[PDB]
Amino acid sequence: DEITFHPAARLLREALGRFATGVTVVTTAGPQGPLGMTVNSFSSVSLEPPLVLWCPARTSARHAAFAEAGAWSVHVLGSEQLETCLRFTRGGRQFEGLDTVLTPEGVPVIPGVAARFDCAAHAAHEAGDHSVLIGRVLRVTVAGPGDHPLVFAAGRFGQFEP
C-alpha cells in the first residue's frame, strides 16, 4: 500500500490528518468583544515552568488579536461538545447566544469543558503560514471525566475507545 510523495497538496493534508488530536477552542478578549478559534495544533510543552503551545493560522482575521494578546485560554473539549467546536470554526456563531463569563485576567471562557488552561503570553515565533504561540499556564480548570475527549482524526470527529 505504501506510497511516497514530495509535499509541494491534497495528499499532504491527508497525511497530516493521520495524526489524531483532541479539539480545543482558544479564547481572548478582542478589540471589540470576545474572540475564539477552534484549534487542534495545541501541545503540552513544559511542566516546570508549565508551558503549552498552539498555532494560529496567519491567514485568519483573528491572528493579530491572538498574537497581540497578553492572555488567552485553551479549552479542551469533551466528546459531547461538537457544537462548541463548530461555533469557533470558519462559519461559526462564535460567542453569539453564549453567556459572558470572564477570568480574573479578563479572558472570556466557556464553562463545562474537559480542561481549561488560562495562559499568559510567554513567547511567539513565525512558522510559515502559521505562528507558534507559547503560553505559561497560570490556572487550570478540569470538569468531568478525563477520558471522553472529542477526537479529530483522518478528517472525522469521533471518540476514544481505550
CB 100 within 8 A of CB 150: no
Site for a second copy in 47-86 (CB under 8 A): 47-53, 55, 76
Instruction: Closer to a second copy by CB, 85 or 114: give it.
Output: 114
Which C-beta is closer to ligand FMN: that of 88 or that of 107? 88
Q: Answer for the pair 154, 18: CB distance below 8 angstroms, yes or no.
A: yes
Residue 115 binds to a second copy (criterion: CB under 8 A): yes
Residue 40 annotated as lining a ligand binding site: yes
C-alpha cell at 64: 493579530
Instruction: Give yes or no for residue 10 binding a second copy (CB under 8 A).
Output: no
Q: Is 90 annotated as a binding residue?
A: yes
Assign residue 53 a region (left: φ > 0; alpha: ψ between -120 and 50; beta: otherwise).
Answer: beta
123-130: long-range contacts, CB 8 A cutoff, minimum separation 24: 124/67, 126/58, 127/55, 129/57, 129/58, 129/59, 130/41, 130/55, 130/56, 130/57, 130/58
Partner whose binding site includes residue 60, from a second copy, ligand FMN, none (CB under 5 to 8 Å by kind): ligand FMN
* 117 lines the binding site for a second copy (CB under 8 A): yes
To a second copy, the closest distance from the beta carbon of 118 in angstroms equals: 9
Q: Which does 12 bind (CB under 5 to 8 A by kind): a second copy, ligand FMN, none?
A: a second copy
Under the criterion CB under 6 A, does residue 150 sit at the interface with ligand FMN?
A: no
Taking CB under 6 A as the criterion, which residues in 37-56 touch ligand FMN? 37-41, 55-56
Quick check: 96 binds a second copy (CB under 8 A)? Answer: no
Binding residues for FMN: 38, 40-41, 55, 57, 90
